[PDB]
Design a protein around this ligand. Structure first.
Ligand SMILES: *[C@@H]1O[C@H](CO)[C@@H](O[C@@H]2O[C@H](CO)[C@@H](O)[C@H](O)[C@H]2NC(C)=O)[C@H](O)[C@H]1NC(C)=O
Ligand SMILES: *[C@@H]1O[C@H](CO)[C@@H](O[C@@H]2O[C@H](CO)[C@@H](O)[C@H](O)[C@H]2NC(C)=O)[C@H](O)[C@H]1NC(C)=O
Ligand code: OLC
Ligand code: OLC
Ligand code: OLC
Ligand code: OLC
Ligand code: OLC
Ligand code: OLC
Ligand code: OLC
Ligand code: OLC
Ligand code: OLC
Ligand code: OLC
Ligand code: RET
Ligand code: RET
Lengths: 296, 296
């Protein structure tokens, strides 16, 4: 079934490989097993469940809001490609140094990173503007993925360097993502909205933190995980990172917009000090509309 | 000098290739010449000249302004890698379907696309905020590059489809980039500043428009251009796209900031209709500060 050379003969007591002169690329490295049938079976189940959640989130969003639908849109196109060509090039890149690189995974990331990070910069959905910090988040995160993809394509000390360059960009991303969530928390009304923001923060840092961990564990790192093993781990954090996070996002947005429908846009001036930061706290009381320096 | 297999024997009248069983990947496709010595020589000269311009722009910017320096920073790191490992994997990816993909080129693009597009969204350097349109520009442009990179890694009708998907995202980018330049033109003071904005628009559309043209002409498309031929074409549009555009950008920014130093921030309300758009026209006269509906 492969469309590289899979048939060869060993000659001179396995010191020579002879192949048909049919123009196909050849490498033993490419033919290594992707894992056990149990790992594969587990991966095909989690993918269908991902397809189901992607399908239901989309129809649900069908009843502003563009970031959640798009991540579900990209996720459904991803599943149709997995279904037909999951291990066909270039869903997997089989390269000259013998590496298998899951370009399918890194491509989806590059596609939706702006969408997710714009949504990070718009949790309430009320903003029409994005600050300087949003721009640093996008630049740092895209650098991270570009260095990481380069690390996956490389070997030896070149892989180590590009991974370290990704980690430096990544730390800058995590640091600034943390400030956004802190501002969001003190912006939204006091009740359920702050539960959802707290939920989104946990989902975000755990699921995003797991990507560099799965890199180090996978064939791109120390080869602890098999390819199916890596797919299974990716499906779990994929469900958290995309479907669940966007679902919680849409829910938060609904709650905020309903607050404007009942109480109206009643802002405050919570001056944080987690520094000398400032925030417009939506409240349910018209009376409350003053400067509350809550130095953290 | 290659670190894939370069030594082989033809057997049974060229129907069989025999290779040392040394674990190296092998493909004839990878060994095709990259072009003539004249093409190579031309490419090495334009690269040094690019290194020189990248070096001088950086020192010059050394005497806010972060987008121009970064593009020169990424450009210098690019040249040191070209100098030592231009045709080593993964600066070029040699893949199982026989393709050579210049990952070096696509990586630089992904890295700086936010930087350039943020700078597009900040020509005057006075804005502290970015509108909804900036976000669509970044999402569309990163999609374009992801589809294009996928097209370069693919073959046959799969390459055609991903290229078309890139073109659809690309058209959305070009359309919205055009509106930004139109707003910028009617925002800046009447004199030299509008010459520079006009210069930046021409540089941008010509240099950005040439990338899909060089794709179609290169090994990733109809193979009209050789690899050195493609490098030469890339160096020319690289000089325009990065160094020259950022230099004109820094110059514009200086002019605008000097306007605030002499006349001060005197805005207007030029209501454009190229629709029902609005603009804050910086003027050199305190008197002029009214609504000028200039329906285009
Ligand atoms: C064919 O090459 C193989 C290399 O595997 C040789 O087999 C082994 O021989 C050495 C003895 O020098 C042992 O260390 C290994 O234990 C042997 N077996 C294996 C499975 O590795 C074999 O001797 C060679 N034959 C000739 C004629 O050179
Ligand atoms: C070895 O294979 C080659 C294939 O190139 C054969 O060479 C050619 O033979 C055919 C005649 O059937 C001609 O059409 C070509 O013009 C020949 N030359 C070349 C350069 O292509 C050759 O006949 C084969 N030998 C044997 C014993 O099968
Ligand atoms: C801020 C977010 C917090 C979470 C961040 C997770 C921290 C992971 C860092 C590990 C350093 C260890 C070195 C990593 C080098 C990776 C490259 C590699 O695997 O090298 C290939 C090998 O040398 C040839 O087979
Ligand atoms: C909006 C910006 C204006 C400028 C935009 C430029 C327009 C280029 C479009 C061409 C369509 C022609 C089809 C292109 C298909 C490309 C894929 C390809 O080369 O296919 C490989 C081939 O089939 C196997 O060798
Ligand atoms: C968790 C993975 C999904 C659910 C388990 C299904 C599975 O793969 O189990 C096969 C079993 O281990 C037979 O070897
Ligand atoms: C998102 C990224 C997509 C990966 C691109 C997936 C493209 C897979 C192409 C499948 C292929 O190899 O096509 C062979 C052909 O269909 C049989 O003759
Ligand atoms: C050093 C780590 C790399 C940090 C990643 C680069 C940050 C992006 C950048 O240079 O942007 C600065 C901008 O001023 C942000 O608002
Ligand atoms: C910040 C200060 C400026 C230096 C920039 C980056 C260091 C990484 C240099 C890139 C080296 C890549 C070479 C390689 O990995 O081979
Ligand atoms: C334009 C390319 C840069 C300047 C020309 C240098 C060059 O490559 O010319 C070699 C000549 O054609 C010998 O065959
Ligand atoms: C920007 C993208 C960078 C491409 C990555 C370039 C990394 C090139 C690595 C060079 C290499 O193959 O290293 C072999 C080694 O130095 C000899 O034994
Ligand atoms: C269909 C072409 C694809 C267009 C590229 C996708 C546009 C990005 C998007 O979906 O964002 C919409 C957002 O509302 C923008 O402000
Ligand atoms: C907009 C409406 C929704 C459809 C989305 C994109 C069409 C492209 C589908 C992706 C097919 C890739 C398969 C391939 O190229 O193989
Ligand atoms: C599809 C959805 C998401 C959220 C994908 C996220 C991917 C990452 C956060 C990747 C992060 C990396 C880091 C932090 C450093 C090493 C290289 C990586 C790209 C794996
Ligand atoms: C390094 C600096 C720049 C400005 C790089 C730009 C690259 C592009 C504009 C690429 C555009 C593409 C398009 C429009 C459609 C086909 C795929 C491409 C990625 C080549």
């Amino acid at each position: 079934r492969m469309l590289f050379q899979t048939s060869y003969t060993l000659e001179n007591n396995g010191s020579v490989i002879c192949i048909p002169n049919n123009g196909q690329c050849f490498c033993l490295a490419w033919l290594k097993s992707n894992g056990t049938n149990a790992e594969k079976l587990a991966a095909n189940i989690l993918q269908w469940i991902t397809f189901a959640l992607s399908a239901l989130c989309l129809m649900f969003y069908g009843y502003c809001g563009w970031e959640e639908i798009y991540v579900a849109t990209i996720e459904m196109i991803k599943f149709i490609i997995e279904y037909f060509h999951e291990f066909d090039e270039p869903a997997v890149i089989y390269s000259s140094n013998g590496n298998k690189t899951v370009w399918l995974r890194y491509a989806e990331w590059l596609l939706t990173c702006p969408v997710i990070l714009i949504h990070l910069s718009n949790l309430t959905g009320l903003a029409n503007d994005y600050n300087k910090r949003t721009m640093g988040l996008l630049v740092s995160d895209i650098g991270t993925i570009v260095w990481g993809t380069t690390a996956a394509l490389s070997k030896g000390y070149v892989r180590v360097i590009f991974f370290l360059m990704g980690l430096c960009y990544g730390i800058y991303t995590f640091f600034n993502a943390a400030k956004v969530y802190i501002e969001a928390y003190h912006t939204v009304p006091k009740g359920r909205c702050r539960q959802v923001v707290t939920g989104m923060a946990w989902l975000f840092f755990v699921s995003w933190g797991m990507f560099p961990i799965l890199f180090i564990l996978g064939p791109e790192g120390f080869g602890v995980l098999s390819v199916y093993g890596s797919t299974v781990g990716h499906t779990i954090i994929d469900l958290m990172s995309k479907n669940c996070w966007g679902l919680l996002g849409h829910y938060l947005r609904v709650l905020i917009h309903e607050h404007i429908l009942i109480h109206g846009d009643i802002r405050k001036t919570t001056k944080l000090n987690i520094t000398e930061i400032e925030v417009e706290t939506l409240v349910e009381d018209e009376a409350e509309a003053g400067a509350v320096s809550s130095e953290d």
